[PDB]
Amino acid sequence: GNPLVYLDVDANGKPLGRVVLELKADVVPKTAENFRALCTGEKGFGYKGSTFHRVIPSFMCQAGDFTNHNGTGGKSIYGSRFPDENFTLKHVGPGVLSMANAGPNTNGSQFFICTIKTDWLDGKHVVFGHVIEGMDVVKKIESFGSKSGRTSKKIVITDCGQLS
Ligand SMILES: O=CN1CCNCC1
Ligand SMILES: O=CN1CCNCC1
Ligand SMILES: O=CN1CCNCC1
Ligand SMILES: O=CN1CCNCC1
Ligand SMILES: O=CN1CCNCC1
């Protein structure tokens, strides 16, 4: 069945806990596989040691730029970018896991976890999972954001991987 993966997150070197994500490989297998492999680091690169670089309260927590750490970077396991697989899953509420992008067909490694229903992103961002456990950790991360997206603490994915 669908993979379960985890992100262990620090703020300013202090552990916040673990976010567990279900990846909906049954609906978006290519997008799920990219995220899964970036969590395990099995291709030689991935999310471990990278940051949540953009966090907006009452919106989203964004991460996955493991090359430039500022929202410009990241890459997929397939190449620098890959197409929007489908828009079948919707941004239904807090806990939705979705791909960040710079327009159509520009998925790399950047992603976000929603903290509200972000319905205006339906048909624009590929939803590929949701938070199974650790929404408390997501809301802690959210609390360290700002309207500009700048974080008030350094938010680091200290470890990540696959649970099943
Ligand atoms: O959350 C929606 N899902 C539908 C497809 N199976 C995975 C779970
Ligand atoms: O609460 C929803 N919002 C929309 C996005 N900007 C932050 C507030
Ligand atoms: O801050 C990261 N960004 C990458 C996704 N598109 C908007 C800017
Ligand atoms: O690419 C990710 N984004 C976060 C949600 N708003 C649009 C840009
Ligand atoms: O906003 C820039 N990005 C780099 C390519 N992956 C999507 C986000």
CSV table of C-alpha atoms and ligand atoms in Angstrom, one decimal:
chain,number,residue,atom,x,y,z
A,1,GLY,CA,0.0,0.0,0.0
A,2,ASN,CA,0.8,3.7,0.2
A,3,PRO,CA,4.2,4.7,1.7
A,4,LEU,CA,4.4,6.3,5.2
A,5,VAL,CA,7.4,8.7,5.5
A,6,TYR,CA,8.6,10.9,8.3
A,7,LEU,CA,10.3,14.3,8.9
A,8,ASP,CA,11.9,15.0,12.2
A,9,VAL,CA,12.1,18.8,12.7
A,10,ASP,CA,14.1,21.1,14.9
A,11,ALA,CA,13.6,24.8,15.6
A,12,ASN,CA,16.8,26.6,16.6
A,13,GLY,CA,18.4,23.2,17.3
A,14,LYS,CA,15.5,22.1,19.6
A,15,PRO,CA,13.4,19.1,18.6
A,16,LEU,CA,9.8,19.8,17.7
A,17,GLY,CA,8.9,16.2,17.0
A,18,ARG,CA,7.9,14.1,14.0
A,19,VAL,CA,5.6,14.7,11.1
A,20,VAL,CA,4.3,11.5,9.5
A,21,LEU,CA,3.0,11.7,5.9
A,22,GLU,CA,1.0,9.3,3.8
A,23,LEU,CA,2.0,9.5,0.2
A,24,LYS,CA,-0.8,8.7,-2.2
A,25,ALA,CA,1.0,6.5,-4.6
A,26,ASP,CA,-2.3,5.0,-5.6
A,27,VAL,CA,-3.3,8.3,-7.2
A,28,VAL,CA,0.0,10.0,-8.0
A,29,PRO,CA,2.7,7.3,-8.1
A,30,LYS,CA,5.4,9.4,-9.8
A,31,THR,CA,5.0,12.3,-7.4
A,32,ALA,CA,4.8,10.0,-4.4
A,33,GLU,CA,7.9,8.2,-5.4
A,34,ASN,CA,9.9,11.4,-5.8
A,35,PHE,CA,9.0,12.5,-2.3
A,36,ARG,CA,9.6,9.0,-0.9
A,37,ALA,CA,13.1,8.7,-2.3
A,38,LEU,CA,14.0,12.2,-1.3
A,39,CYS,CA,13.0,11.3,2.3
A,40,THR,CA,15.2,8.1,2.3
A,41,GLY,CA,18.1,9.9,0.5
A,42,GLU,CA,18.6,6.7,-1.5
A,43,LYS,CA,19.6,8.4,-4.7
A,44,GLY,CA,22.4,10.3,-2.9
A,45,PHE,CA,20.5,13.5,-2.2
A,46,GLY,CA,17.3,14.5,-0.4
A,47,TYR,CA,15.6,16.5,2.4
A,48,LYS,CA,17.8,15.5,5.3
A,49,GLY,CA,19.5,18.6,6.7
A,50,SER,CA,17.4,21.1,4.7
A,51,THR,CA,14.9,23.7,6.0
A,52,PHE,CA,11.4,25.0,6.0
A,53,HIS,CA,12.3,28.3,4.2
A,54,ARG,CA,8.9,29.9,3.9
A,55,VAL,CA,6.1,29.7,6.5
A,56,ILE,CA,3.0,31.7,6.5
A,57,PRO,CA,0.6,31.5,9.4
A,58,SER,CA,-3.0,30.5,8.5
A,59,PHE,CA,-1.7,29.2,5.2
A,60,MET,CA,1.2,26.8,4.8
A,61,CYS,CA,4.6,25.5,5.7
A,62,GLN,CA,7.0,25.2,2.7
A,63,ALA,CA,10.2,23.2,2.5
A,64,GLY,CA,12.3,21.0,0.1
A,65,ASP,CA,14.8,23.5,-1.3
A,66,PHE,CA,17.8,21.4,-0.5
A,67,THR,CA,20.1,23.0,-3.1
A,68,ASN,CA,19.7,26.8,-2.4
A,69,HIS,CA,17.7,26.9,0.9
A,70,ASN,CA,15.7,29.9,-0.2
A,71,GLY,CA,12.8,28.8,-2.5
A,72,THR,CA,14.7,29.0,-5.8
A,73,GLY,CA,16.1,25.5,-5.8
A,74,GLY,CA,15.6,21.8,-5.3
A,75,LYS,CA,15.5,19.0,-7.9
A,76,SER,CA,13.5,15.8,-8.5
A,77,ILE,CA,14.8,12.2,-8.6
A,78,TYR,CA,13.9,12.3,-12.4
A,79,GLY,CA,15.8,15.5,-13.4
A,80,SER,CA,15.5,19.2,-12.6
A,81,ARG,CA,11.7,19.3,-13.1
A,82,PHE,CA,8.8,17.0,-13.8
A,83,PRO,CA,5.3,17.4,-15.1
A,84,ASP,CA,2.1,17.9,-13.1
A,85,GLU,CA,1.0,14.3,-12.8
A,86,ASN,CA,-2.7,15.0,-12.2
A,87,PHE,CA,-4.9,17.3,-10.1
A,88,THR,CA,-7.2,14.5,-8.8
A,89,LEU,CA,-6.6,15.1,-5.0
A,90,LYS,CA,-7.8,18.5,-3.7
A,91,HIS,CA,-6.6,20.9,-1.1
A,92,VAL,CA,-9.3,19.9,1.3
A,93,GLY,CA,-8.0,21.3,4.6
A,94,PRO,CA,-5.2,21.5,7.1
A,95,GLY,CA,-2.6,18.7,6.7
A,96,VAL,CA,-2.7,18.4,2.9
A,97,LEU,CA,0.7,17.7,1.4
A,98,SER,CA,1.2,19.4,-2.0
A,99,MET,CA,3.9,20.3,-4.5
A,100,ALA,CA,5.3,23.8,-4.7
A,101,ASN,CA,5.9,25.0,-8.2
A,102,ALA,CA,6.8,28.0,-10.4
A,103,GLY,CA,3.9,27.4,-12.8
A,104,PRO,CA,2.7,24.4,-14.8
A,105,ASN,CA,5.0,21.4,-15.0
A,106,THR,CA,7.8,22.7,-12.8
A,107,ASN,CA,7.7,20.2,-9.9
A,108,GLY,CA,11.1,19.6,-8.3
A,109,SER,CA,11.5,18.8,-4.6
A,110,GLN,CA,9.9,21.8,-2.9
A,111,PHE,CA,6.6,21.0,-1.1
A,112,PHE,CA,4.2,22.5,1.4
A,113,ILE,CA,1.9,21.3,4.2
A,114,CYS,CA,-1.3,23.3,4.4
A,115,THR,CA,-2.6,24.6,7.7
A,116,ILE,CA,-6.0,25.7,6.2
A,117,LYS,CA,-8.1,24.6,3.3
A,118,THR,CA,-6.3,26.2,0.3
A,119,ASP,CA,-8.9,25.5,-2.4
A,120,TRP,CA,-7.6,28.2,-4.8
A,121,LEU,CA,-4.6,25.9,-5.4
A,122,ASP,CA,-6.7,23.1,-6.8
A,123,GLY,CA,-5.8,22.5,-10.4
A,124,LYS,CA,-2.5,24.4,-10.0
A,125,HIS,CA,-0.5,22.3,-7.4
A,126,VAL,CA,-0.3,18.5,-7.3
A,127,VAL,CA,-1.6,17.2,-4.0
A,128,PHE,CA,0.1,13.9,-3.1
A,129,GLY,CA,-0.4,13.1,0.6
A,130,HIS,CA,-1.5,14.3,4.0
A,131,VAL,CA,-0.3,14.4,7.6
A,132,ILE,CA,-1.1,11.1,9.5
A,133,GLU,CA,0.5,12.2,12.8
A,134,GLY,CA,2.3,15.3,14.0
A,135,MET,CA,-0.1,18.1,13.1
A,136,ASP,CA,1.0,19.6,16.5
A,137,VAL,CA,4.5,19.8,15.0
A,138,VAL,CA,3.2,21.4,11.8
A,139,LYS,CA,1.3,24.0,13.9
A,140,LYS,CA,4.5,24.7,15.9
A,141,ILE,CA,6.3,25.3,12.6
A,142,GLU,CA,3.4,27.5,11.5
A,143,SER,CA,3.8,29.6,14.6
A,144,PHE,CA,7.4,30.5,13.7
A,145,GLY,CA,6.3,31.9,10.3
A,146,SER,CA,5.2,35.5,9.4
A,147,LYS,CA,3.1,37.2,6.8
A,148,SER,CA,6.2,37.7,4.6
A,149,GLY,CA,7.0,33.9,4.9
A,150,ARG,CA,10.2,34.6,6.7
A,151,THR,CA,10.7,32.3,9.7
A,152,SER,CA,11.6,33.6,13.1
A,153,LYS,CA,13.5,30.4,14.0
A,154,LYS,CA,15.7,28.2,11.9
A,155,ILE,CA,13.5,25.2,11.1
A,156,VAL,CA,15.5,22.1,10.1
A,157,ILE,CA,14.5,18.7,8.9
A,158,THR,CA,17.2,16.9,11.0
A,159,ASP,CA,16.2,13.4,9.8
A,160,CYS,CA,13.7,11.9,7.5
A,161,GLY,CA,12.9,8.5,6.0
A,162,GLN,CA,10.4,5.8,5.2
A,163,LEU,CA,8.3,4.0,7.9
A,164,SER,CA,6.6,1.6,5.6
B,1,LIG,O1,-7.1,10.7,1.0
B,1,LIG,C1,-7.6,10.2,0.0
B,1,LIG,N1,-7.3,9.0,-0.5
B,1,LIG,C2,-8.0,8.5,-1.7
B,1,LIG,C3,-7.1,7.5,-2.4
B,1,LIG,N2,-6.6,6.5,-1.4
B,1,LIG,C4,-5.6,7.2,-0.6
B,1,LIG,C5,-6.4,8.1,0.3
B,2,LIG,O1,-6.4,32.1,6.6
B,2,LIG,C1,-6.3,32.2,5.4
B,2,LIG,N1,-5.4,33.0,4.8
B,2,LIG,C2,-5.3,33.0,3.3
B,2,LIG,C3,-3.8,33.1,2.9
B,2,LIG,N2,-3.2,34.2,3.6
B,2,LIG,C4,-3.2,34.0,5.1
B,2,LIG,C5,-4.6,33.9,5.6
B,3,LIG,O1,9.7,30.3,-1.6
B,3,LIG,C1,9.6,29.4,-2.5
B,3,LIG,N1,9.0,29.5,-3.7
B,3,LIG,C2,9.1,28.4,-4.5
B,3,LIG,C3,7.6,28.0,-4.9
B,3,LIG,N2,7.0,29.2,-5.6
B,3,LIG,C4,7.0,30.4,-4.8
B,3,LIG,C5,8.3,30.8,-4.2
B,4,LIG,O1,4.6,26.9,-4.9
B,4,LIG,C1,4.1,26.9,-3.8
B,4,LIG,N1,3.3,27.9,-3.4
B,4,LIG,C2,2.7,27.9,-2.1
B,4,LIG,C3,1.2,28.1,-2.3
B,4,LIG,N2,0.9,29.3,-3.0
B,4,LIG,C4,1.5,29.3,-4.4
B,4,LIG,C5,3.0,29.0,-4.4
B,5,LIG,O1,10.1,28.4,-7.4
B,5,LIG,C1,11.0,27.7,-7.9
B,5,LIG,N1,11.0,26.3,-7.8
B,5,LIG,C2,12.2,25.6,-8.3
B,5,LIG,C3,11.7,24.4,-9.2
B,5,LIG,N2,10.8,23.6,-8.4
B,5,LIG,C4,9.6,24.4,-8.1
B,5,LIG,C5,9.9,25.6,-7.2
